[PDB]
């Protein structure tokens, strides 16, 4: 059947599925007013889990709640994905800022702790991920970096990036992606060393000119979905730039949204079932 894409982003009001094949909207579910939703995910059964900054939640595919978690006050919720394991880790910004582990039932599996020294919960972080050795890869905003977290909040290892680090997502050789934010670009990071192996800008892609590089989506084939979003740059809207791109493996885009009536801004991405 048709690949189908859960969406969501910052700045836009409903999460949404697409139908790649045919571009449409088939489904959507309302946000509420001052929910911000940065991350959005699917399990394998194809339920829904989303982060909206006031709190994560998990719905069937027929808008049903299953669970919740509040973000406590002033804290922001913006990490929400599935792991491989196939359970959820959820994360906060804020004092402090905090990780946890979930199953199906809403259920605290894990939790981690850390301060990163960022006084405003919204200049932490958007999409924490789980490395190999059971860590977290924490990308900053305030302070252009990735830092790596033990499960006890000990920190472990700090890079350096440049603009706004959004997200991470692992290659099959065991590196990672790193978006970059307001850098318009994203980097690949070595697994052993920590090094920047290769830096991915506009230039270096053929199609596409980078506003905020949010979520990236590795695919199986060798190329990746590229989340565009627009919403800090006032020139974007007077132009026609795609909200989501798919570049293959010689950076060329082969496959893109564009209509930023039809679709909101988008910041995050997953593959779903229907
Ligand atoms: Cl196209």
Known sequence: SP???LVGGSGWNKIAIINKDTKE????????????????????????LFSYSKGAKMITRDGRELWNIAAPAGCEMQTARILPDGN????????????????????VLSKTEFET??????????????????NYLVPLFA???VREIAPNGQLLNSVKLSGTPFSS?????????????????????????????????ANDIEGVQLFFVAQLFPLQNGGLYICNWQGHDREAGKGKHPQLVEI????????????????GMISTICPIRE
């Open 169 to 201: 997502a692992f290659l099959d050789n065991g590196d990672c992606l790193v978006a970059c934010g307001d850098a318009h670009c994203f980097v690949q990071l070595n697994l052993e060393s920590n090094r920047i192996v290769r830096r991915v800008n």
């Open 248 to 263: 293959d493996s010689e950076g060329k885009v082969v496959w893109q949204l564009n209509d930023k009536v039809k679709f």
């Open 3 to 5: 690949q189908h894409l």
């Open 25 to 48: 909207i088939v489904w959507e579910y309302p946000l509420e007013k001052g929910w911000e939703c940065n991350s959005v995910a699917a399990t394998k059964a194809g339920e829904i």
């Open 143 to 145: 302070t252009s970096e």
């Open 88 to 107: 959820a880790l959820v994360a906060w910004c804020g004092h402090p800022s905090t990780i946890l582990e979930v199953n199906m039932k809403g259920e």
């Open 117 to 134: 020294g960022i006084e405003r919960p919204h200049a932490q972080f958007r999409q924490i991920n789980k490395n190999k050795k059971g």
